[PDB]
């Protein structure tokens, strides 16, 4: 714990980045979090929405 | 079957060509909600029930 000041920086950044990646899976109201699963199922006028 | 006692037919282990339905002139209603009627031929399903 003596070096906690440096470890804390690493932990904060690793966590911020891991949060940014996991967040990628959110739907945000979309039918799917994966673009390929939208494009393969819907035509442009609906896929774009 | 009657609407109160509708039939449940399982479709499995087969090739589903949906263009034979979509491009026909025999249907008055062809309403697909989670998928486009013309994307069906590019998809696989665990089961399809009619």
Pick from A32, A45, A30: nearest CA to B37 = A45
DSSP string, chain B: --GGG----EE-SS----HHHHT-SS-S----SSS-TTTGGG---S-EE-
Distance CA A35, CA A12 (A): 29
> CA–CA distance from B22 to each of A21, B6, B11, B36, B37 (Å)?
40, 23, 18, 10, 7
Distance (Å, rounded) from C-alpha B10 to C-alpha B22? 20
Query: Within 10 Å of residue A46's Cβ, how many Cβ atoms?
Result: 14
- Contact check, Cβ <8 Å, B43/A31: no
CA distance B50 to B33: 16
Task: Please check whether residue B40 is in contact with residue B33, taking contact to mean a CB–CB distance below 8 angstroms.
Answer: no
- Chain B CA closest to residue A43: B36
Resolution of this entry, Å? 2.7
Which alpha helices (H) appear in A1-49, and where do they start and end?
4-22, 36-39, 44-47
Contacts of B38 in chain A (CB under 8 A): 43
Report how this structure was experimentally obtained.
cryo-EM
């Amino acid at each position: 714990s003596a070096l906690g000041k440096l470890q804390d920086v690493v932990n904060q950044n690793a966590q911020a980045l891991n949060t940014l990646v996991k967040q990628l899976s959110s739907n945000f109201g979309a039918i799917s979090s994966v673009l390929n699963d939208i494009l393969s199922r819907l035509d442009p006028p609906e896929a774009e929405v | 079957a009657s609407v109160y006692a509708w039939n449940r037919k399982r479709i499995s282990n087969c090739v589903a060509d949906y263009s034979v339905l979509y491009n026909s002139a025999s249907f008055s209603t062809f309403k697909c909600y989670g998928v486009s009627p013309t994307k069906l031929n590019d998809l696989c399903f665990t089961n399809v029930y009619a």
